[PDB]
Amino acid sequence: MLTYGAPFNFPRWIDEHAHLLKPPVGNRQVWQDSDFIVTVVGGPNHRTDYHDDPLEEFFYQLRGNAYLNLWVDGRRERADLKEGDIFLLPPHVRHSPQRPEAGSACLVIARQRPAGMLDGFEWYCDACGHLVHRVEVQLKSIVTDLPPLFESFYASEDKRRCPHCGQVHPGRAA
Amino acid sequence: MLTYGAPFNFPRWIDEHAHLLKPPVGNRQVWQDSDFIVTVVGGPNHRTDYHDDPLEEFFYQLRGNAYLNLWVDGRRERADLKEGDIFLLPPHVRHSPQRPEAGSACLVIARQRPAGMLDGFEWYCDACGHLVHRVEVQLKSIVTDLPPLFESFYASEDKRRCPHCGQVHPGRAA
Numbered sequence A, B: 001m002l003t004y005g006a007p008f009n010f011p012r013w014i015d016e017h018a019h020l021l022k023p024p025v026g027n028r029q030v031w032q033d034s035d036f037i038v039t040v041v042g043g044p045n046h047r048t049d050y051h052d053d054p055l056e057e058f059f060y061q062l063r064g065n066a067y068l069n070l071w072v073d074g075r076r077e078r079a080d081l082k083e084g085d086i087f088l089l090p091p092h093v094r095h096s097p098q099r100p101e102a103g104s105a106c107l108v109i110a111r112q113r114p115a116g117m118l119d120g121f122e123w124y125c126d127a128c129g130h131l132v133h134r135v136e137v138q139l140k141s142i143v144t145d146l147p148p149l150f151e152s153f154y155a156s157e158d159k160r161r162c163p164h165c166g167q168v169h170p171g172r173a174a
């Protein structure tokens, strides 16, 4: 049967769950236990991490504007997500979503990762740009696994200390 | 780098490629050679087949309305796709997309199938409902593998002959 239920109005669903799109991530999954992970992300969010997703991610900015901070070579870049843009992110491109606008909404689609395909979360030095800290995880929820991770980074000066220049990353106000 | 290029305006892309959304399928792939198969489908299309997709499919009806004829038990059903609806179709649910409206557009997202994960295309008897004909394929393009398949069904009375009641399926005007 229709395991994921019947079709429904998306604009109206987003209006109804707007109150639930909370920071740091601003996440919300539309269907549970499905192979496609379909989420709506709103603003304002708070992200200092770069995600290393080992699969592709699809974006469609439905309301408001946002941008992804990226590493493209070793260079800091930004891909803008103006209202109405779509974007397909290749695997492993480090990205840090910035969602400043209240009432913002972006459709974000990813797939369940196979066992032993791990996500990376990375922070980089503000001063020298060297990698400061990386955690790899077998992700089981993009909604409710993210903020505990950021938490233990923020709460610890040794994790935030650049191993190249010794600058201590600002953590939860970067 | 950004293999699939940078973000771009989706409404405008659809307007620009509207002339290309041709029947029977009405298909068009946004990015090539990617793991997510992201297509826009428009109308009017012409579909008599039921697709047995071994992975999930995501739908977001962006412009116009459409419906999927389904088999849910062994029962013929219809899930309507009114403008603005989203829908996640489970694996293997037989579906026949009907897109009657000109200037219609639906975002449809699927994944590349692994080797040896085959798609099924099926036709059913109008009179008795028995399965008339099934082809399994290792799909390599959802745009440009579909219509040749339908073609050899339509062009052949033995393929269209119900093995239960001997009724010959109407083929290319069903």
Ligand SMILES: Nc1c(O)cccc1C(=O)O
Pocket: A025, A027, A041, A051, A053, A057, A097, A099, A106, A108, A142
């Ligand atoms: N891209 C994202 C991710 O991988 C996890 C959570 C949120 C987002 C986003 O785009 O905001």
Ligand SMILES: Nc1c(O)cccc1C(=O)O
Pocket: B025, B027, B041, B051, B053, B057, B097, B099, B106, B108, B142
């Ligand atoms: N669902 C579809 C598919 O699997 C192939 C081609 C077209 C569609 C559609 O929704 O029209």
Ligand SMILES: [Fe+2]
Pocket: A051, A053, A057, A095
């Ligand atoms: Fe991400």
Ligand SMILES: [Fe+2]
Pocket: A125, A126, A127, A128, A129, A130, A162, A163, A164, A165, A166, A167
């Ligand atoms: Fe540093």
Ligand SMILES: [Fe+2]
Pocket: B051, B053, B057, B095
């Ligand atoms: Fe299909």
Ligand SMILES: [Fe+2]
Pocket: B125, B126, B127, B128, B129, B130, B162, B163, B164, B165, B166, B167
């Ligand atoms: Fe029959």
